[PDB]
Ligand binder design. Structure first.
Ligand SMILES: CN(C)CCNC(=O)c1cc2n(n1)CCN(c1ccnc(N)n1)C2
Length: 330
């Protein structure tokens, strides 16, 4: 089997991407944030504290004839950005782009933090990291991909995120028309539960490529590109007037600037992030200071190849017995 679904930016800045997902019988379609950095499929629901719902579409398990409460199971998750959610667990039928899994754990939120409440466009998350990170207790549950994998034509999914435009998540096949050149594959460590890999270096604009190992994670659920302070300083030094602002929480730059590209290495291959992809717009409405899309990972403890990087590539998440990642230009 295969599946194919369009993923759409939630706003004009590509702050996140949503993909429609069918849950239950009859189907309830929710728009979920597909997140290769986490491993829980959780949704706003009829159980979510009413004051914490503000425009989201909710899953109502009592209206699904295939929903079953998973006895005694609870979940609770905190994301690196300070947000959190928790609740109980059903199993139900879940379909993405025509690919169906029966018995998928659907984590129903009883509580969500304010950043989720304030995101009316995101109805929940669909985790695509390794199932060792799943938070369901006392019995850990499998991700949608892990449940689907045996049925897929090939044990893979691909992320093709758009810049200011829709893109695609495919399951079970590699669309050879969706990229240029070849796909370069690179080793993955699953020891922290992430799609963790080592970039071979970087360049800023037309500058020399710096060969240096950068360990990080391929994370569709993180918007920005978080890299070591040395690398980030080298990038922003090429933007007149850019500075790191402690009050704003990162590098900012004059909105009148034209940003240089940023290149990262995948083996001997190179992925070029156009400068425009690094502009996240005014820090506050009407400001002429703009927020940068490349930020330091120093506070984080891990480098993160988020949407800013991944949207410049066609990315293969190969879930074979020994997982690997593939990157192509597009
Ligand atoms: C019981 N087992 C051993 C652990 C259960 N899971 C975790 O400890 C865990 C930590 C994170 N996540 N799960 C998922 C969201 N996170 C992140 C971090 C970075 N990027 C993203 N997208 N999510 C951080």
């Amino acid at each position: 089997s295969t599946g194919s679904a369009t993923t759409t930016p939630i706003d004009s800045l590509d702050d996140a991407y949503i993909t429609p997902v069918q849950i239950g019988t009859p189907a309830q379609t929710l728009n979920l944030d597909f997140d290769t950095g986490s491993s829980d499929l959780w949704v706003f629901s009829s159980e979510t504290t009413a004051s914490e719902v503000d425009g989201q579409t909710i899953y109502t398990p009592s209206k699904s004839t295939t929903a079953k409460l998973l006895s005694g199971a609870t979940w609770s998750i905190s994301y690196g950005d300070g947000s959190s959610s928790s609740g109980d667990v059903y199993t139900d039928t879940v379909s993405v782009g025509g690919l169906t899994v029966t018995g998928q754990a659907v984590e129903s939120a009883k509580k969500v933090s304010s950043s989720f409440t304030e995101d009316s466009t995101i109805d929940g998350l669909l985790g695509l990291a390794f199932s060792t990170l799943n938070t369901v207790s006392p019995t850990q549950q499998k991700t949608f991909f892990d449940n689907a994998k045996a049925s897929l034509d090939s044990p893979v999914f691909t992320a093709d995120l758009g810049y200011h435009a829709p893109g695609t998540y495919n399951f079970g096949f590699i669309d050879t028309t969706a990229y240029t050149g070849s796909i370069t594959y690179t080793a993955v460590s699953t020891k922290q539960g992430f799609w963790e890999w080592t970039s071979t270096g970087y360049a800023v604009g037309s500058g020399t490529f710096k060969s240096t190992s950068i360990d990080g994670i391929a994370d569709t659920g993180t918007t920005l590109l978080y890299l070591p302070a040395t690398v980030v300083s080298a990038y922003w030094a090429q933007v007149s007037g850019a500075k790191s602002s402690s009050s704003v929480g990162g590098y900012v730059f004059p909105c009148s600037a034209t940003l240089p590209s940023f290149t990262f290495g995948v083996g001997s291959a190179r992925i070029v992030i156009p400068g425009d992809y690094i502009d996240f717009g005014p820090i506050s409405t009407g400001s002429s200071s703009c927020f940068g899309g490349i930020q330091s990972s120093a506070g984080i403890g891990i480098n993160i190849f988020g949407d800013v990087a991944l949207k410049a590539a066609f990315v293969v998440f190969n879930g074979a017995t020994t997982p690997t990642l593939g990157f192509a230009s597009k």
